Fold this protein.
Amino acid sequence: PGISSVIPTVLEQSFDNSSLISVKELLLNKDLIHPSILLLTSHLAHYKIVGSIPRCIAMLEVFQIVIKDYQTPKGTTLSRNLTSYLSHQIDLLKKARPLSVTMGNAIRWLKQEISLIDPSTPDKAAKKDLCEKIGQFAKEKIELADQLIIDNASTQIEESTTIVTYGSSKVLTELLLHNAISLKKNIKVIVVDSRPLFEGRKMAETLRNAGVNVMYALITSLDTIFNDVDYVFLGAHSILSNGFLYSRAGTAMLAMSAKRRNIPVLVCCESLKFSQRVQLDSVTFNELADPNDLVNIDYENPVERRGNKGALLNQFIKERKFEKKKLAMENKPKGNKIGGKKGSEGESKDASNEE
Amino acid sequence: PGISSVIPTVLEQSFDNSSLISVKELLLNKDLIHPSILLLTSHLAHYKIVGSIPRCIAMLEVFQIVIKDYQTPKGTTLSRNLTSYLSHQIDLLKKARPLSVTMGNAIRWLKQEISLIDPSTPDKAAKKDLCEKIGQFAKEKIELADQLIIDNASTQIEESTTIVTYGSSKVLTELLLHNAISLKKNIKVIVVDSRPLFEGRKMAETLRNAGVNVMYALITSLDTIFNDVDYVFLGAHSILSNGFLYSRAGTAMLAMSAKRRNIPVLVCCESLKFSQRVQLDSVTFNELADPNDLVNIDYENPVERRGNKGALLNQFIKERKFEKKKLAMENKPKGNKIGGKKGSEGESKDASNEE
Amino acid sequence: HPNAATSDVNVTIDTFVAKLKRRQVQGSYAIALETLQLLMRFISAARWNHVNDLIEQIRDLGNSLEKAHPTAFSCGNVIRRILAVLRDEVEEDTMSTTVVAEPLISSMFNLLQKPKTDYRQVAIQGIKDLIDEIKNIDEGIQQIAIDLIHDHEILLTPTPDSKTVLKFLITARERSNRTFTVLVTEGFPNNTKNAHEFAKKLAQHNIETLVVPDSAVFALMSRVGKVIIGTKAVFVNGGTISSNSGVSSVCECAREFRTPVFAVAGLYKLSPLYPFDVEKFVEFGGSQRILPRMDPRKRLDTVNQITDYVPPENIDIYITNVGGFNPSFIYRIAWDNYKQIDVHL
């Protein structure tokens, strides 16, 4: 039927409310459940590349696929135990990896769609239209927005550039590629990497795949760099109703450093990723993972040395935990690039009530 | 010594750096204890007037009196049990209420003096000179210091000034009086005061008795007279070798306000106020009395009323704690004027080598 | 229009006036209720048919009331809200009676370019709705506050008295597993008794209470996590005038040491009027409960203010019945219920 149990490592003391634990290795589940979703969830769980942009798209694609495959029962209508099935799927997803703002939005959209075409329609007529509608939506709200953002970025550079960069976000990478290629400017890219999930390395690889003049650094190695260098960029995941930056890891420190050294930062935003939920701290709701994210020593990821550290539960009287999603300072990043080109973060919910 | 401990009130979960309570009501007193000290203790237990400077003077006077009373015994020598007696007195003082740096310095000086004069000298001749020397010391390291402070103020302060102060800083009061009556200039003097102590009120009264225009102030607002205020002196108690100040009540707040709005603050002190001990927060060493100053509903101090207030243990868990001495900052009190005339508090121990 | 008909039309107007001027009335919600009742009375006996004139009269009345007391706002605000409610309906009605209207959404430039029904019953129903809303903000704000508080955090609670704030606190306490510490500043003048009452109420349910002196904030602010205020008056640029006693200095301290600030608020308690000068809006208070006897008052000059204004540089969240809003954004919220026209008359 399904049971949790067995949690790895020490539970510490602080930050004890969020679902993060359990079903890593597969051992007996429910009967007539479609396994593609499960597979996707598993992939998401053991992923080291994904960041903000693609996950939601992938989910959408999966849903589309499901719809295409969907069989209408020989006796009952299209939705009766379907809702139950969906609920189960949602639960499974939750168990695997937390449902973000994008995921919530997707769920809302699904619900809207359900409301639109409610128990009356046969097999290959309703879903034929629905799928196409979904495709159209995908074409509209996302890709075109990205294109717009790219074009905005294109103009945003005038005379000479020397840049320090961070982020897994695809849009930033795309921008960088554009700068390298179809603009032929005097671009310089300095890369900052983060430990929990590797983004900097990916960025570097992408740069290489183009052939760019590239400097490389990390979270702490910052001070000696600025001894000419101007522009700084960041990539955010989601912004709340509050106006505060509820994004991924090492951004805020970098931003602060930039502020100190007298040339500010610009982050890129999306015209969908906004939530009804209200938070201003780390404790409320956070991306939290198993302490295995900080085990590997030197150069690369897969090396494994039996030298100094290699235990968690055996490490008696020790409280080992780490944060993934951070709540960055509101006044620090100056420019934000959405569908309406340019504007301050004083917008906050100027698209939320717009619906 | 007598009887110790046996007192109400809990240890308190918040703030317990120093011990909190004592000897108030006399029963079974020892034969050798001088009553003057007891009287002083009784006064201090419920004192309104004195603070830092006059206390030390009083102590000195008491010591002088004790010296006058005492003669060299037949069996025991002059330097046989005097030191022990002194130690006992110090212990008693500690038991009563924690003391000042100036007092410590005075004690040290006394000890040095004791060490200096050999017991083989004629006894009558000895204390005849010793007392004179003590008097000289008193004249120099207090009255002369005050005079020096006054003269410093004279050169520095502009043609008639609006002056703001806090507490019961006797030297500053004296200076104000001098300005009013002796040298004759305009004195728009503003005094602030808190709930637990009526020091400010007392100061105002004194000023009135001398014929001075005073502006009375409380906690709820200060800025109401600022937003106009031009030149400010702060309340003083003790200085550290950091460049900070260990002073009374919401002086820190005032300093902060000054820093924010227009002009910094300045404090003049005695050359024997300085310590060589150091601290940097209001958690280090807290000076405490009984939580009873706010139990009586405002107005006067001795009232004895029937009402509602008086729930230290009566109701379902209640604590009514307070503080007397807090940390004053460094970046804001730029001025320090002593027996060495001129200097900054950034030069935190420039006079400690010279003395 | 003057106060000439406002005696023979309704039963209790003089008493209301007295309450406004001489402060016989307590509680902002109660005041609001009274105003609603007055409005009902105005409506029930009178038959008008001509609506614009009536609206204008009401506006005038509101203005007069505002002029009567320079720092009382709630009564005025309620009236303004009611006017706003009426106005849109009236506009709709006119458009039906006459018979392009809307191109996209709520757009500007309308200030420069040229723009029998069962109405009484509808108006009555609106008033009833308003009354209901005023009654049940307790079930409105209830589940927005339990989204920002957690464990091992010290909470400063200055100036508590109102039944809204108290109810919020009770709700917070109900889930007692969350670690919250209650620090209450006494508030020098009037707030002391209220604070004591609050403490007593807390003790009734069993909630830990710690008493704070007003002088000592600098020695505590570095330890305190989150601050909650139960304010009465909310303003344009993000500032507030709260229910009396020492807030400004505390806020300054918080700003210096960097401390997050929450507020239990209502949009009906929010004012569209902007405070522009410190010299006017800050209200000075009585020295009756400071020093006994008046012979020292000849030479000395006692400076005292009861109710205080807060600059928007400090507070960051306004938890309401709708949700938490940004101070440098609350103007939009206000305008989603009020107008630019009903300010200067």
Observations:
- The first helix of chain A runs from residue 35 to 45.
- The radius of gyration of chain A is 23 Å.
- The CA atoms of residues 193 and 201 of chain A lie 7 Å apart.
